[PDB]
């Protein structure tokens, strides 16, 4: 219990939730709160999302 600290306020929390071990895949830790009342991903208003890479490659190809 003393070590237990899922959030990073008292014990620092890696952005990568866990440290992967050899012979195992890298999976996110199960969150403490598993509520599924989540919206679709939100983006800033007037967010630029044009496929610049594809446009540049097509322009180069001509």
């Amino acid at each position: 219990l003393l070590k237990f600290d899922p959030f990073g306020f008292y014990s620092p929390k890696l952005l990568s939730e866990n440290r992967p071990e050899e012979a195992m895949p890298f999976y996110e830790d199960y969150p403490q709160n598993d509520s599924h009342w989540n919206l679709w991903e939100q983006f800033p208003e007037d967010f630029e999302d044009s496929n610049a890479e594809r446009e540049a490659i097509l322009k180069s190809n001509k």
Binding site: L1, L2, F4, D5, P6, F7, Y10
Partner: protein
């Protein structure tokens, strides 16, 4: 006298041996607003308070304040 102190987990929101540095200002900002709320409640309730007559006062039976029976 008391029990020996033991570690309490940081993540757990419990009151074991909790002491706040800013307790003075916390008390100041928790007492006076509560006093004002109670003052408002008190002045609201005083409108519906009843007291018996004073030492030198008698209730006139025919005065409106005197109790009145139902008239069928």
């Amino acid at each position: 006298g008391g029990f020996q102190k033991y570690p309490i987990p940081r993540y757990l929101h419990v009151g074991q041996w909790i002491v706040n540095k800013n307790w003075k200002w916390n008390t100041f900002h928790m007492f006076f607003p509560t006093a004002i709320l109670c003052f408002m409640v008190w002045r609201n309730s005083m409108i519906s308070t009843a007291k018996p007559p004073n030492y030198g006062e008698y209730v006139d039976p025919q005065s409106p304040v005197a109790p009145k029976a139902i008239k069928y």
